[PDB]
RNA sequence: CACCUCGAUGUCGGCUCGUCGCAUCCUGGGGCUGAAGAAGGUCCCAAGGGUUGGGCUGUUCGCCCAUUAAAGCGGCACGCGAGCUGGGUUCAGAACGUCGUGAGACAGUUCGGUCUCUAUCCGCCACGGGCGCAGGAGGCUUGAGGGGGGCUCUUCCUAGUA
RNA sequence: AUAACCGCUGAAAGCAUCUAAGCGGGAAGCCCGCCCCAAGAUGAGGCCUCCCACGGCGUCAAGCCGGUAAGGACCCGGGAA
């Protein structure tokens, strides 16, 4: 179930076949597998990956030259591709061909403490007529004596954003092995420069 | 003359087959052992019990239509968070857990009842961890 | 009266092996295992096999007929048990054969393709008549059933898949 | 009926926010038809999701316009005023009809009429601190168990075939 | 895996019967599948890699004190947090 780490670079549009095709280019660099998981030692199947080669040594003492391909140990190792057992070490963007569909996990921009209405797209209060300081407010939260309490899922304002988000079935528009680029259309989560992991789709697999 | 009370005792183990044993009828005794109401020094506030190991628990058998008709329910916290799970489904997904459940409900409630339940170790199919003595009981 | 749970069976190509819950038939055309009640003895005698019930309550009586007939079928089974005919009626409707599989056109926008299950064999002597060959009776009758359920007989016309025999019908209609 | 509440359990409607029931409005699956087809009728299964925008009236409801797959019915203190409104009702002003000699009065009408910054506990949304997880650490991850989600229409080909 | 339903095989009841023993189909529903949280799952899981088994009193059931080790903190420059 092929997968590879990357960073959101930025967006643009591509003009394919006289159509616009807005695209989000994510760079998925070479990915030096530093561990494998086995139903023997582990009980499931995956690859550790590792990405962004930097630090000279901030790596300190716990480390792997155990798989030793961690030579130039990487900043972010973010790991499981789950059931993926690749060809040799070092998965590349060669992994994906254009027209392939893919799911993309990433970290949604943090909005911090966000009202109901933007958290939950609540309606809010009227801006006039009676009004009185409830324009941006949630309304009733419950009934009366029964149940005499508030349901355990109840949509309210709190930290919103800065969370795991996986937008699915994205089309691979292009892949540029040269610079390790990759082009998908649209939705992919989070800030430019943030980490994204990129997997084959679950429409079929 | 005060009534005798145990000093710290030796935690005897015990092994049980469960294959073909009924359920609640197997449960009854597993409870009694767990409490140690078979020991003549029995003390309510302490729990000098037996540790119980039960095997072949996928193999408990039960009467009537219970395999289909009997339901376990789980309320989460949430609207419509009551889950309804048939016996067949349980056994097929987590075998045992049905014996663990039947026994738990039969142990008392409170700090100590919850401790005794730790002393009942249930496994599916044959074998188990071989550490202690575990005299086979029938 | 004179209820059919205790006549006698038949010999001559075939063996009967009574196990505790099951009996193994094993005759010229194949072998069938008949699950039977654990209770209720079945006794094999000369050139015949009987079945006897423990009690006279309707619980054993009902099991009694069933059990005799269940075994008997397996004996009829392992010597010529197939039958199950099925003629196809109406215009565009024809049946063809593909390898072991059966393909029929009943008037959908596709052909419908039915592979035979284990121990079942298809025959098409004319495109408009079919035959389902088998050792196992219940499995023949099912497979036959399944075929007929694609396009069952219309109420308003003769079009469909008909068990041979199985008379025809007129509402009439408009 | 008069049982808790008159040393106070704020009352219609709206709005916001829902959650549940199923006697199901729609969608899915069915039987019967006085079911040719299409389209209905009736009854069974089914609560997953859905269930429009306006005119009029304080209205609920209803009627109507234009649509729709449909424009479901109930419960939750006729859900929800320490969430909002305040049109209605329901103080004090004023008028009409009417009743009363009168003062006044009317589930009759009319116009007007103070809706209280600070959340202790439970509950709910978020977020940390502590300790535990019997050697301590830096990574990585299994998923028991939860939650989210769950709608539907038109057209075209099949085929102007059956 | 099931609902209503449609069937097979099939007695009790020589016939018949989807049902009493069985089996097969069969729903936007159920259980999985998807996405998210998730080991306070005190039933506290697992894998990789590190540091190491000092010195004294407690001559002992746990410890204790001082530096330590791997590692952390603190302080600082910042951040689509
Ligand atoms: Mg922010
Ligand atoms: Mg939002
Ligand atoms: Mg507004
Ligand atoms: Mg204002
Ligand atoms: Mg209130
Ligand atoms: Mg309550
Ligand atoms: Mg009273
Ligand atoms: Mg009285
Ligand atoms: Mg009162
Ligand atoms: Mg009071
Ligand atoms: Mg009060
Ligand atoms: Mg119903
Ligand atoms: Mg229908
Ligand atoms: Mg019709
Ligand atoms: Mg109908
Ligand atoms: Mg529903
Ligand atoms: Mg106007
Ligand atoms: Mg108006
Ligand atoms: Mg009205
Ligand atoms: Mg309307
Ligand atoms: Mg409601
Ligand atoms: Mg009322
Ligand atoms: Mg109310
Ligand atoms: Mg108010
Ligand atoms: Mg209140
Ligand atoms: Mg007013
Ligand atoms: Mg007054
Ligand atoms: Mg007068
Ligand atoms: Mg008045
Ligand atoms: Mg009045
Ligand atoms: Mg004024
Ligand atoms: Mg006013
Ligand atoms: Mg309280
Ligand atoms: Mg904490
Ligand atoms: Mg789970
Ligand atoms: Mg779930
Ligand atoms: Mg046409
Ligand atoms: Mg069935
Ligand atoms: Mg029959
Ligand atoms: Mg018969
Ligand atoms: Mg049955
Ligand atoms: Mg099935
Ligand atoms: Mg759907
Ligand atoms: Mg996770
Ligand atoms: Mg832990
Ligand atoms: Mg752990």
From Swiss-Prot, chain A:
One example GO MF annotation: structural constituent of ribosome
SUPFAM superfamilies linked to this entry: Translation proteins
Protein name: Large ribosomal subunit protein uL3
Family recorded in the similarity comment: Belongs to the universal ribosomal protein uL3 family.
Record-level GO cellular component terms: cytosolic large ribosomal subunit
Assembly information from the UniProt record: Part of the 50S ribosomal subunit. Forms a cluster with proteins L14 and L19.
Signal sequence extent: none
Residue ranges the record marks as coiled coil: none
General function of this protein: One of the primary rRNA binding proteins, it binds directly near the 3'-end of the 23S rRNA, where it nucleates assembly of the 50S subunit.
Keywords annotated in UniProt: Ribonucleoprotein, Ribosomal protein, RNA-binding, rRNA-binding
Keyword Ribosomal protein annotated: yes
Any GO BP annotation: translation
HAMAP family the UniProt entry points to: Ribosomal_uL3_B
TM ranges: none
Curated annotation (Swiss-Prot), chain B:
GO molecular function: mRNA binding; structural constituent of ribosome
A Pfam family assignment: Ribosomal_L13
GO CC list: cytosolic large ribosomal subunit
GO biological process, alphabetically ordered: negative regulation of translation; translation
Keyword field: Ribonucleoprotein, Ribosomal protein
Physiological role: This protein is one of the early assembly proteins of the 50S ribosomal subunit, although it is not seen to bind rRNA by itself. It is important during the early stages of 50S assembly.
Complex formation: Part of the 50S ribosomal subunit.
Family statement drawn from the similarity comment of this UniProt entry: Belongs to the universal ribosomal protein uL13 family.
Protein's name in the database: Large ribosomal subunit protein uL13
Organism phylogeny: Bacteria, Thermotogati, Deinococcota, Deinococci, Thermales
Gene: rplM
Swiss-Prot record, chain C:
Name assigned to this protein: Large ribosomal subunit protein uL6
A biological-process GO annotation: cytoplasmic translation
Cellular compartments per GO CC: cytosolic large ribosomal subunit
GO MF term (any one): rRNA binding
Family: Belongs to the universal ribosomal protein uL6 family.
Quaternary structure, from the entry: Part of the 50S ribosomal subunit.
Keywords, comma-separated and alphabetical: Ribonucleoprotein, Ribosomal protein, RNA-binding, rRNA-binding
Manganese among keywords: no
Pfam families in UniProt: Ribosomal_L6
Entry keyword RNA-binding: yes
InterPro entries according to UniProt: Ribosomal_uL6-like (IPR000702), Ribosomal_uL6-like_a/b-dom_sf (IPR036789), Ribosomal_uL6_a/b-dom (IPR020040), Ribosomal_uL6_bac-type (IPR019906)
Function noted in UniProt: This protein binds to the 23S rRNA, and is important in its secondary structure. It is located near the subunit interface in the base of the L7/L12 stalk, and near the tRNA binding site of the peptidyltransferase center.
Coiled-coil boundaries: none
């Amino acid at each position: 179930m092929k997968g590879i780490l990357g960073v959101k670079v930025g967006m643009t549009r591509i003009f394919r076949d006289d159509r616009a095709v807005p695209v989000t280019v994510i760079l998925a660099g070479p990915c030096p597998v530093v561990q494998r998981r086995t139903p023997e030692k582990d009980g499931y199947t995956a690859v550790q990956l590792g990405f962004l080669p930097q630090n000279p040594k901030r790596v300190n003492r716990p480390l792997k030259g155990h798989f030793a391909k961690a030579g130039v140990e990487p900043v972010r190792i973010l790991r499981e591709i789950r059931d993926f057992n690749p060809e040799g070490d070092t998965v590349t963007v060669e992994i994906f061909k254009p027209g392939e569909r893919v799911d993309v996990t990433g970290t949604s921009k943090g909005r911090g403490f966000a009202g109901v209405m933007k958290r939950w797209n609540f309606a809010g209060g009227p801006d006039s007529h009676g009004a009185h300081k409830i324009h941006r407010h949630p309304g009733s939260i419950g009934n009366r004596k029964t149940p005499g309490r508030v349901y355990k899922g109840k949509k309210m304002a709190g930290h919103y954003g800065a969370e795991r988000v996986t937008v699915m079935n994205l089309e691979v528009v292009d892949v540029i092995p040269e610079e390790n680029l990759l082009l998908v259309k649209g939705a992919v989560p989070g800030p430019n420069g943030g980490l994204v992991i990129v997997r084959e789709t679950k429409k079929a697999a | 003359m005060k009534t005798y009370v145990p000093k710290q005792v030796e935690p005897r183990w015990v092994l049980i087959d469960a294959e073909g044993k009924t359920l609640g009828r197997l449960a009854t005794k597993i409870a009694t052992l767990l409490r140690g109401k078979h020991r003549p020094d029995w003390t309510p506030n302490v729990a000098m019990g037996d540790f119980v190991v039960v095997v072949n628990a996928d193999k408990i058998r039960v009467t009537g239509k219970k395999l289909e008709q009997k339901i376990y329910t789980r309320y989460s916290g949430y609207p419509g968070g009551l889950k309804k799970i048939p016996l067949e489904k349980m056994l097929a997904t987590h075998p045992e857990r049905v014996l663990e459940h039947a026994v738990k409900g039969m142990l008392p409630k409170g700090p100590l009842g919850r401790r005794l339940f730790k002393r009942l170790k249930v496994y599916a199919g044959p074998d188990h961890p071989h550490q202690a003595q575990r005299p086979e009981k029938l | 009266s004179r209820i059919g749970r205790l006549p006698i069976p038949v010999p001559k190509g075939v063996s009967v092996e009574v196990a505790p819950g099951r009996v193994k038939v094993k005759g010229p055309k194949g072998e069938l295992e008949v699950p039977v009640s654990p209770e209720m003895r079945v006794v094999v005698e000369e050139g015949v096999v009987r079945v006897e019930r423990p009690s006279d309550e309707r619980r054993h009586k009902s099991l009694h007929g069933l059990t005799r007939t269940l075994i008997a079928n397996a004996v009829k089974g392992v010597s010529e048990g197939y039958s199950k005919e099925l003629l196809i009626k109406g215009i565009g409707y024809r049946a063809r054969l593909v390898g072991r599989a059966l393909e029929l056109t009943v008037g959908f926008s596709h052909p419908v393709v039915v592979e035979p299950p284990e121990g079942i064999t298809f025959e098409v002597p004319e495109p408009t008549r079919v035959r389902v060959s088998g050792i196992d009776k219940q499995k023949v009758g099912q497979v036959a059933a399944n075929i007929r359920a694609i396009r069952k007989p219309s109420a308003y016309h003769e079009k469909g898949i008909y068990y041979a025999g199985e008379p025809v019908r007129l509402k009439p209609g408009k």
